[PDB]
Amino acid sequence: MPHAFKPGDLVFAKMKGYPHWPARIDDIADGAVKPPPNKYPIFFFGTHETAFLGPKDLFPYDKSKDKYGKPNKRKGFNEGLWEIQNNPHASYS
């Protein structure tokens, strides 16, 4: 059975006006800005941007890849696909 989301989990993350986007749940660095309550820090592969999202917007990668894991015209997207498949836990600072 599923657990709660935890740092390191791989997802497709959905934001308004964007396709479901390869992403991960990030850690919060010591001394760094925490998310609001019930929100997770989401790191988007390819663009390397962070947003704060709740579970409604988070689709587990394994389950969802056959649907969402296809090339897209949007900037950063196909780079994002490579990252999530090839080095999803790397530092992208």
UniProtKB/Swiss-Prot annotation:
Tissue-specific expression: Widely expressed. High expression is found in heart, skeletal muscle, ovary and testis. Overexpression is frequently observed in hepatocellular carcinoma samples.
Residue ranges of every copy of the PWWP domain listed in the record: 7-64
Domain of life: Eukaryota
UniProt-annotated location(s): Nucleus; Cytoplasm
Quaternary structure note: Interacts with HDGF. Interacts with trimethylated 'Lys-36' of histone H3 (H3K36me3). Interacts with trimethylated 'Lys-79' of histone H3 (H3K79me3), but has higher affinity for H3K36me3. Interacts with IWS1. Interacts with H2AX, POGZ, RBBP8 and CBX1. Interacts with histones H3K9me3, H3K27me3 and H3K36me2. Interacts with DPF3a (isoform 2 of DPF3/BAF45C). Interacts with SMARCA4/BRG1/BAF190A, SMARCC1/BAF155 and SMARCD1/BAF60A in a DPF3a-dependent manner.
Family of this protein: Belongs to the HDGF family.
Function summary: Acts as an epigenetic regulator of myogenesis in cooperation with DPF3a (isoform 2 of DPF3/BAF45C). Associates with the BAF complex via its interaction with DPF3a and HDGFL2-DPF3a activate myogenic genes by increasing chromatin accessibility through recruitment of SMARCA4/BRG1/BAF190A (ATPase subunit of the BAF complex) to myogenic gene promoters. Promotes the repair of DNA double-strand breaks (DSBs) through the homologous recombination pathway by facilitating the recruitment of the DNA endonuclease RBBP8 to the DSBs.
Protein name: Hepatoma-derived growth factor-related protein 2
Gene name of the encoded protein: HDGFL2
Stretch of the intact protein here: 1 to 93 of 671
